[PDB]
Write a protein that binds this ligand. Sequence first.
Ligand SMILES: *[B@@]1([O])OC2=C(C([O])=O)[C]=[C][C]=C2[C][C]1[N]C(=O)[C]([N]C(=O)N1[C][C]N([C][C])C(=O)C1=O)C1=[C][C]=C(C([O])=O)[C]=[C]1
Length: 324
Amino acid sequence: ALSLDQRIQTLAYEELNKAVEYHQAKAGTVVVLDARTGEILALVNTPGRNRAVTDMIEPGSAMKPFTIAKALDSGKVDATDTFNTLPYKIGSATVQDTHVYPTLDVRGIMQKSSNVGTSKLSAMFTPKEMYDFYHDLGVGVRMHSGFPGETAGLLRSWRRWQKIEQATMSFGYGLQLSLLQLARAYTVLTHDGELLPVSFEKQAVAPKGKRVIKASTAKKVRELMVSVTEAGGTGTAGAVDGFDVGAKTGTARKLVNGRYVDYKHVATFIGFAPAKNPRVIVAVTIDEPTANGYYSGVVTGPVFKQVMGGSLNILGVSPTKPLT
Ligand SMILES: *[B@@]1([O])OC2=C(C([O])=O)[C]=[C][C]=C2[C][C]1[N]C(=O)[C]([N]C(=O)N1[C][C]N([C][C])C(=O)C1=O)C1=[C][C]=C(C([O])=O)[C]=[C]1
């Protein structure tokens, strides 16, 4: 028997399709996991192959919570620490944000989704320490989910990284994974710092996870990620009435075998709830929206919202706070 939950699978299907239509997008995917077991409660694609497991993307901004996770886990950075977030140079290259903040603390980097900040956090570690970390989240590794065509994604060896590549990788370019690997990766945040295996089958035994960061770190990062959906953050479109939601937006220019083209984007929105004691991850990706803008927030936010809200209703999770 499958872990799939028909009500949720139906909900995801309806909501994905409304969005991919509304935004005149080329393709789309939604994945819902059990946050505490890695079971796939829903997995849905626009008609065609199972993109959620066969296709690989650059995570972009959705990678940022891990870089922060790693920094805090190390003991070398505390959430309250301030960083100069102005544009800067890695030799011949320039790291910069869309909107420029002189300084941010770690919560601001998460909230405002700053490349500069994220790359400074990364810059505090070796090529090897960051590759080992990405590797332990499952980037470049086979999940063994049993789906046909399962990509392992792409993690180039640290042994051949320029300094610019360490940076661009810390904020999600240069490495690749499936939306399902990405959702799986978030089990580190939701399952108290342990990476769960994913499954399309009901587990008789509750599955064990491999430890990657401490529980207290996961706990703190979840707290920080709530900033994304509160006023001031990139991801307010994904707030759900009656709950705190940890989420991360991602808006990426499209890598088309080699070159970045800048009038083409991929919108991804991923998060969990209840933020303090999470039950589900929802990951949404929409490929190349043409109509009504391209920001994660506008495109994938509403679908995240509906699916998360509907998912916690269906599983019978009680609101943690009164409905507005
Ligand atoms: B990220 O995705 O978070 C984010 C959001 C969000 O959270 O939804 C919204 C606006 C900006 C950002 C910053 C992050 N995205 C980008 O930096 C993105 N940049 C890229 O796609 N690339 C690809 C190529 N390389 C390596 C060669 C890069 O370093 C790079 O920057 C970006 C930049 C500008 C815009 C835009 O149209 O304003 C969108 C996305």
